[PDB]
Motif scaffolding. Structure first.
Motif, PDB file in Angstrom:
ATOM      1  N   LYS A   1       4.922   6.774  -4.350  1.00  0.00           N
ATOM      2  CA  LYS A   1       4.555   6.324  -5.689  1.00  0.00           C
ATOM      3  C   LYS A   1       5.806   5.955  -6.472  1.00  0.00           C
ATOM      4  O   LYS A   1       6.505   6.822  -6.999  1.00  0.00           O
ATOM      5  CB  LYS A   1       3.757   7.405  -6.401  1.00  0.00           C
TER       6      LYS A   1
ATOM      7  N   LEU B   1       8.051   1.961  -7.991  1.00  0.00           N
ATOM      8  CA  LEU B   1       8.034   0.517  -8.176  1.00  0.00           C
ATOM      9  C   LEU B   1       9.307  -0.070  -7.585  1.00  0.00           C
ATOM     10  O   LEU B   1      10.392   0.498  -7.744  1.00  0.00           O
ATOM     11  CB  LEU B   1       7.915   0.145  -9.661  1.00  0.00           C
TER      12      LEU B   1
ATOM     13  N   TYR C   1       0.827  -1.204   0.000  1.00  0.00           N
ATOM     14  CA  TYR C   1       0.000   0.000   0.000  1.00  0.00           C
ATOM     15  C   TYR C   1       0.861   1.254   0.000  1.00  0.00           C
ATOM     16  O   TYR C   1       0.558   2.224  -0.704  1.00  0.00           O
ATOM     17  CB  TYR C   1      -0.939  -0.004   1.208  1.00  0.00           C
TER      18      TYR C   1
ATOM     19  N   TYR D   1       2.406   1.665  -3.607  1.00  0.00           N
ATOM     20  CA  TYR D   1       1.576   2.118  -4.716  1.00  0.00           C
ATOM     21  C   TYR D   1       0.986   3.505  -4.502  1.00  0.00           C
ATOM     22  O   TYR D   1       0.841   4.257  -5.472  1.00  0.00           O
ATOM     23  CB  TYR D   1       0.442   1.122  -4.979  1.00  0.00           C
TER      24      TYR D   1
END
Length: 411
Positions: free
Chosen positions: A271, A273, A264, A267
């Motif tokens: 923000k 990856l 959580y 993502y």
């Protein structure tokens, strides 16, 4: 491929005779039965003709005729045992029981008329009087506690988790504080690139500091909880206990809720990856599923008995210098108090006669054994039903986890 294969097309009578000496105790065992090589099926009954048995019956199963193994047609040019018939073969074995004594067996397996005869001379040495063998503390079976694919998957996922943990630790220590790390990650997609290492959640999950010191040693980079959690799941995964299963289940639930939390954060609130993070999350989910499966098996294995594997693979390689074969395998006997007694099997087979014998490629035999009692038999005895099937050699990839090159690594 032999004349010897011809001799196993139907039902063959079997006679087994064993003379033994374990720590000075002499004993004789005579068994009779029949074998069906087309089904790989053995039906036998053994009796101790000298009173009570000084060793547990399951310790003698391997000692007490692999020529009845079912070889698929594709593998029939790898069947050494049948090609040595009717003259037969000598089978010698050293069986080392961990922290206990050792069996030395020499046997002749040959055709006498219509009957396949297996004569065995056994001697055990250096056995503890109160060990699991001489103390008769071994269960009367040859089962496999946890299924094999679950053990393999567990050690693989735990190992990969430890490696990803060590790598994430290496990036946190030696990569994450450099400015060139920030500059290069803003222009390149790398597995080492993640914004959580030099972040609030990089240490102790963000929480667990402001629950604790924020400088205290209990606040740690998440990779530390990684090595710890995965090595812990590995070492406790070796033990099959209700306690161990409960602990592993709880820790796995903690890992999946932590993975959902940091996901959580990954993502929405940070923000970016992180491939390492996502991979470790998948590994947590896999460990969760494996632990849940271990509990479900722990509760419903008695229903699923009828469909358990309980197969032991004996690993066979060629021995050209002696015109025969070698074999190695490990039998795990379950002890009454929950512990495990290991049995290392070193084996060699040489042909008795002078005839063309098949020297096989490396393969294995999958052997299932069922031990029971005869209520009409008053002597110390054992009823044995075996299912042996050769495996380890195909062309296709759809069954590649069954290949010998992958099975040998997990034994």
């Amino acid at each position: 491929m032999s004349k010897g294969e011809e001799l196993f097309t139907g039902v063959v009578p079997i006679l087994v005779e064993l003379d033994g000496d374990v720590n000075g105790h002499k004993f004789s065992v005579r068994g009779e039965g029949e074998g069906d090589a087309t089904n790989g099926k053995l039906t036998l009954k053994f009796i101790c003709t000298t009173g009570k048995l000084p060793v547990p019956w399951p310790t003698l199963v391997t000692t007490l005729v692999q020529c009845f193994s079912r070889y698929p047609d594709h593998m029939k040019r790898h069947d050494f045992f049948k090609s040595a018939m009717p003259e037969g073969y000598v089978q010698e074995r050293t069986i080392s029981f961990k922290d206990d004594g050792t069996y030395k067996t020499r046997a002749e397996v040959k055709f006498e008329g219509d009957t396949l005869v297996n004569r065995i001379e056994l001697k055990g040495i250096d056995f503890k009087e109160d060990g699991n063998i001489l103390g008769h503390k071994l269960e009367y079976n040859l089962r496999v506690s946890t299924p094999r694919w679950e053990r393999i998957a567990r050690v693989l996922v735990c190992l990969l988790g430890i490696l990803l943990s060590l790598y994430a630790f290496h990036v946190e220590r030696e990569h994450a504080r450099d400015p060139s790390y920030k500059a290069l990650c803003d222009v390149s997609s790398s597995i080492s690139c993640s914004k959580v290492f030099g972040s609030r959640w990089g240490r102790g999950f963000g929480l667990l500091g402001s629950i604790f010191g924020n400088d205290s040693a209990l606040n740690q980079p998440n990779s530390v909880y990684g090595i710890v959690f995965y090595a812990f799941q590995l070492l406790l995964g070796m033990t099959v206990s209700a306690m161990a299963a409960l602990i592993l289940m709880t820790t796995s639930i903690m890992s999946v809720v932590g993975s959902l939390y940091l996901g959580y954060i990954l993502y929405f609130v940070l923000k970016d990856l992180c491939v390492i993070c996502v991979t470790t999350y998948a590994l947590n989910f896999i460990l969760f599923v494996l632990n849940y499966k271990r509990l479900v098996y722990l509760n419903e294995a008695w229903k699923q008995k009828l469909k358990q594997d309980n197969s032991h693979n004996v690993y066979i390689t060629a021995d050209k210098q002696k015109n025969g074969i070698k074999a190695n395998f490990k039998i795990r006997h379950n002890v009454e108090d929950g512990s495990v007694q290991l049995a290392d099997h070193y084996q060699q087979n040489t042909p008795i006669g002078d005839g063309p014998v098949l020297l096989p490629d490396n393969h294995y035999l999958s052997t299932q054994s069922v031990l029971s009692k005869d209520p009409n038999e008053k002597r110390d005895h054992m009823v044995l039903l075996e299912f042996v099937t050769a495996a380890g050699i195909t062309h296709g990839m759809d069954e590649l986890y069954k290949s010998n090159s992958l099975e040998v690594l997990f034994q």
